[PDB]
């Protein structure tokens, strides 16, 4: 009869904007069966309190699925874990909207979770179809190590190994580390022209104002970087012509909840059309049994998707994050941010405005020298 | 653009079945779930069954139900309705539309067919 | 279930307002969506407003959404104009379709 989809929304009105869209997601198929309330909850201070509050306000009322969002005001330092801790234990799905950290691509760890954005290794995808395009074949990668050197360099390198070239020297970094010169230093003197950085943003910073004072950046030196790393400290610690990445939609939130509770209700209901429907248990405490039927709704949900929304079109990979993404190629040219192309799928389309590489030399530069 | 084309009807005496067939052309066949909406020649339409972008959800109207079966391949872009044991009162048109969502659920429909005619008689 | 209504047919001489409605038999008309149907005789019939007050791409404006509740009903307002643009009409909410109504220009 009556379901219920719970929610770890970031302000008020959020909330309104996710109850207006849970009416209309309802008010299409409605005819008996189904009503498909919704419960809402606000984000809480600490870590310890919001473990105990999805387990007293949000478990305590049959959730059939919980939905994350990213607090509004501090930084990544508090990433969502206690939502994926806590309703995994009894294998309750949860959806994702705006988290992009690499640590939720596996499911050693975090065993139910699944986004809509894919976080930050797909970026390294770009790389091989964006090389190709421009006539450069050997690169150095120059990548930083806490988590994500251990994913987004090993994406790229698994993936180019069906070329059969591989990279060369593929160098790294203790994350938050000064005078990184003299491990700069062994980079300069090489072969391949096309470094490609990938790492935090504070630690970028470093690296940029360290480059700049070895004449690193005069001439035929391209440079690749992805979206965190141009992000907001390109405004005085960058140089001129970091052809960087950025997501089309991104802190989008109002879009995304009218998408998300879209796929969702499309296959709530088709469960709810099967033989063997357990309801989740009402109480975190005084149950210890895992949901019998949470595998199942985590494989339909996982497989079917297609809601054709406005953010696109959803479809879900054999492993969580959405694949099938809308990326946008940047530009720095005189502290500004001129688009050059559009990433669709599997193709890059380039546009009718000249770009500028770090040196004004408007050409091609050859990578090899 | 988009168009679809379907045909293969004709006068059966009744008792026996038939299969019909409606091809698409344009639009991509993967994404959009398709119903199948019959006329009545003087009156209203009516609804006559249903299938998913894929598989899985099917659905039938309430005298439809049993008579008729449903099925799509996105081979060729094509869509199948097989009948049998028709019967005097299932004499109409028989159009071929396609949805607007994923799903059938939303009913909604947009870039009918072309008609088709179908009639038991002896 | 249910039985869509509306009225039988109608006719305006060319300039003015026409209104057709489509009346709910049980429960609230909002519970559920309303969409009208375009189709000339002889041809195939084609949307002209979907999703309560809604155009797709093609549709000269003019036709206009009326979910006004009143005694649970829907209607359908369209701006002065007849031109060649008089047939037949259709309300469909769930998996039911209106009697049907035809619009007759006045000659």
């Known amino acids: 009869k009556i379901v219920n989809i719970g929610a770890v929304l970031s302000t008020r009105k959020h909330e309104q904007m996710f109850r207006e869209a849970v009416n209309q997601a309802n008010k299409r198929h409605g005819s008996w069966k189904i009503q498909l309330n919704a419960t809402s909850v606000t984000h809480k201070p600490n870590a310890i309190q919001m473990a105990l509050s999805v387990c007293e306000d949000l478990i305590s009322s049959q959730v059939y699925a919980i939905l994350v969002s990213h607090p509004p005001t501090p930084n990544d330092h508090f990433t969502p874990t206690p939502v994926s801790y806590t309703a995994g234990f009894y294998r309750i799905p949860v959806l994702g909207l705006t988290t992009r950290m690499s640590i939720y691509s596996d499911k050693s760890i975090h065993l139910s979770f699944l986004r809509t954005v894919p976080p930050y290794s797909h970026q390294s995808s770009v790389w091989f179809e964006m090389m190709r395009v421009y006539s450069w074949n050997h690169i150095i990668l120059l990548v930083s190590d806490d988590h994500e050197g251990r994913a987004a360099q090993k994406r790229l390198e698994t993936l180019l190994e069906e070329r059969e070239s591989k990279a060369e020297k593929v160098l790294q970094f203790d994350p938050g580390t000064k005078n990184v010169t003299a491990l700069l230093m062994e980079a300069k003197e090489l072969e391949a022209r096309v470094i490609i950085l990938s790492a935090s943003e504070d630690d970028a910073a470093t690296v940029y104002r360290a480059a700049a004072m070895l004449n690193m950046t005069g001439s035929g030196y391209v440079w690749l970087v992805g979206e965190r790393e141009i992000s907001g400290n390109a405004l005085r610690y960058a140089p001129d012509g970091i052809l960087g990445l950025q997501l089309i939609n991104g802190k989008n939130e109002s879009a995304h909840i009218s998408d998300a509770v879209g796929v969702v209700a499309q296959a709530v209901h088709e469960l709810l059309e099967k033989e063997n429907i357990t309801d989740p248990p009402r109480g975190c405490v005084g149950n210890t049994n895992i949901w019998k039927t949470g595998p199942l709704f985590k494989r339909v949900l996982m497989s079917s998707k297609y809601a054709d929304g406005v953010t696109g079109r959803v479809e879900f990979n054999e492993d969580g994050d959405r694949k099938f993404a809308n990326y946008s190629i940047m530009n720095l040219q005189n502290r500004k941010l001129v688009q050059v192309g559009i990433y669709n799928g599997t193709h890059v389309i380039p546009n009718d405005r000249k770009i500028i590489w770090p040196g004004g030399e408007t050409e091609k530069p050859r990578g090899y020298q | 653009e988009v168009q679809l084309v379907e045909s293969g009807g004709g006068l059966v005496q009744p008792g026996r079945s038939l299969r019909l067939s409606c091809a698409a052309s344009?639009?991509?066949?993967?994404?959009?779930?398709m119903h199948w909406v019959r006329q009545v020649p003087g009156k209203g339409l009516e609804w006559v069954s249903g299938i998913s972008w894929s598989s899985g959800s099917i659905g039938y109207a309430d005298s439809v139900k049993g008579r008729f079966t449903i099925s799509r391949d996105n081979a060729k872009n094509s869509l199948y309705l097989q009948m049998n044991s028709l019967r005097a009162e299932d004499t109409a048109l028989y159009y071929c539309?396609?949805?607007?969502?994923?799903?059938?659920?939303?009913?909604?429909?947009?870039?009918w067919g072309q008609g088709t005619l179908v009639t038991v008689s002896s | 279930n249910f039985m869509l209504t509306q009225p039988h047919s109608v006719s305006e001489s060319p300039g003015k307002t026409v209104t057709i409605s489509c009346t709910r038999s049980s429960g609230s008309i909002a519970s559920n969506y309303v969409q009208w149907y375009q189709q000339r005789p002889g041809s195939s019939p084609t949307t002209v407003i979907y999703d309560d007050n809604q155009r797709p791409s093609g549709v000269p404006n003019r036709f206009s959404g009326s979910i006004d509740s009143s005694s649970n009903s829907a209607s359908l307002i369209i701006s002065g104009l007849k031109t060649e643009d008089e047939a037949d009409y259709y309300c469909?909410?769930?998996?039911?379709f209106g009697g049907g109504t035809k619009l007759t220009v006045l000659g």
């Open positions: 469909q909410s769930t998996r039911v």
């Open positions: 539309a396609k949805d607007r969502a994923s799903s059938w659920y939303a009913y909604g429909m947009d870039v």
């Open positions: 344009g639009f991509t066949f993967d994404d959009y779930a």
